[PDB]
Paper text:
The pro-oncogenic cellular activities of estrogen receptor alpha (ERα) drive breast cancer pathogenesis. Ligand-dependent transcriptional activities depend on the association of coactivator proteins with ERα to form functional complexes. SERMs and SERDs elicit a structural rearrangement of the ERα LBD to sterically preclude binding of coactivators in the activating function-2 cleft. Activating somatic mutations near ERα helix 12, Y537S and D538G, enable hormone therapy resistance in metastatic ER +breast cancers.
Interestingly, RU39411, which significantly enriched ERα levels (SERM-like), showed enhanced transcriptional inhibition compared to most molecules.
Numbering used by the authors:
A (entry chain A): 309 to 336, 341 to 416, 419 to 531, 533 to 546
B (entry chain B): 309 to 337, 341 to 545
């Protein structure tokens, strides 16, 4: 029942904080810093996911499935968003801005992919309001095709998810109309934004490939995610 | 310069044929071998199709190879999902190779992917995806999949990226026009456009999982090389 303006207000209000890397800056490695940062960001991501309109209407199992599918894409879109005003570098945290040379485990290709994404956001002059919409779309869409369930409940859950996704589409279009874009510019920009999400999916897949290769007891389990969502 | 109708006409005409699996149907019924040979032959036709997608051959041959390298398995997959739409619970790899979920388990690499593909065809059916929309989506995959990974900012590459995005914009216009022709409201148009493009993220995911398996095989030419793709495009 939320208006487009109310949807934007809700998403802006739900935004998680920007966290810091944990290292003492007076002291003279990187994977441990990034892993600890991501570990702390995931806790705040669960809080954010619960404030995305329609997300807590789903079952806890479906909430876990969506977050299990989307968490690294959500970390990556956040990283790209905070790196937009840092050409050629990635702002993992305010105290951890790395260039491509510093990027050289698992980042041989991904670093450049992330840089290219932030470059594209810059080319498009992506707005904060648009960004939070995109991030919510990732949460709701990434796992919606892989519930592996044809129960009556699951059919209803998928319908709900797509209704909420439709509302966010309406909201994105509304933001563009507010800005004075023509109808043609509106549907072109909508398409351009959603097509970037495929690239973010690609980057997450490559990132998840590395995390699994580590064989470190480093990918959040279903049961960990379930514990956090119901806490 | 193409109009929306002309863009659709062009894409419909560029459509590759549906190929058959190569096995003797009188012999006892090898699945990965059959599927690989099928895909090998499909890829040859895919290159012909790609060259007929408006705007594609305007690109440098290097950039054409890069786009196809990025997109080819996605394109095979959306093709598969399209020709499986009217076969719930099954995948029509070829007209003489219709596999169900149980048979899917006989296929290495498909423990999760088979169900993912089925879910996509189910979603296409629920949306009543039209042929005109399908060819638009397939062209979008070709142009979009590799456009952020050129790893070049030569003046030429800047121009190539702009061109690609202008063509992508035209296909967006074309999709919206098809929906308007069908009498959808403006709200329904932008909702459906979004629904269609969001499925492309799932298709990328499936391709990445498929590519993971192909690389795991450590089989020469089971992933087409850059030079193989270049030889076919040229
Ligand atoms: C969350 N806990 C439960 C599990 C730890 O997950 C992690 C641990 C480390 C990262 C780092 C390290 C990588 C995966 C590299 O290898 C290849 C891509 C890297 C990503 C990039 C995205 C990203 C964004 C962030 O803002 C913080 C960390 C990271 C990552 C990302 C997620
Ligand atoms: C093209 N030549 C140069 C290289 C061979 O590429 C191949 C070889 C075999 C396939 C098969 C086997 C798989 C990858 C499984 O493993 C996991 C996903 C499978 C995909 C599914 C998509 C697909 C669609 C087709 O219409 C024909 C084959 C296939 C594939 C797909 C592509
Ligand atoms: Mg704008």
């Amino acid at each position: 029942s939320l208006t487009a303006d109310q949807m934007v207000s809700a998403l802006l209000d739900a935004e998680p904080p920007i966290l810091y890397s944990e290292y003492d800056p007076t002291r003279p490695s990187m994977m441990g810093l990034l892993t600890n940062l991501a570990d702390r960001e995931l806790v705040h991501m669960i809080n954010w996911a619960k404030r995305v309109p329609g997300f807590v209407d789903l079952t806890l199992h479906d909430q876990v499935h969506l977050l299990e599918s989307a968490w690294l894409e959500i970390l990556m879109i956040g990283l790209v968003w905070r790196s937009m005003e840092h050409p050629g570098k990635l702002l993992f945290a305010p105290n951890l801005l790395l260039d491509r040379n510093q990027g050289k485990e698992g980042m041989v290709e991904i670093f450049d992919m992330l840089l290219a994404t932030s470059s594209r956001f810059r080319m498009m002059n992506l707005q904060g309001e648009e960004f939070v919409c995109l991030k919510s779309i990732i949460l709701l869409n990434s796992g919606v095709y892989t519930f592996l369930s044809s129960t009556l409940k699951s059919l209803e859950e998928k319908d709900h998810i797509h209704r909420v996704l439709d509302k966010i589409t309406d909201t994105l279009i509304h933001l563009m109309a507010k800005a004075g874009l023509t109808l043609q510019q509106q549907h072109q920009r909508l398409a351009q934004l959603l097509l970037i999400l495929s690239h973010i999916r690609h980057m997450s897949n490559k990132g998840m490939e590395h995390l699994y290769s580590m064989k470190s007891k480093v990918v959040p389990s279903y049961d960990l995610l379930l514990e956090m969502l119901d806490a």
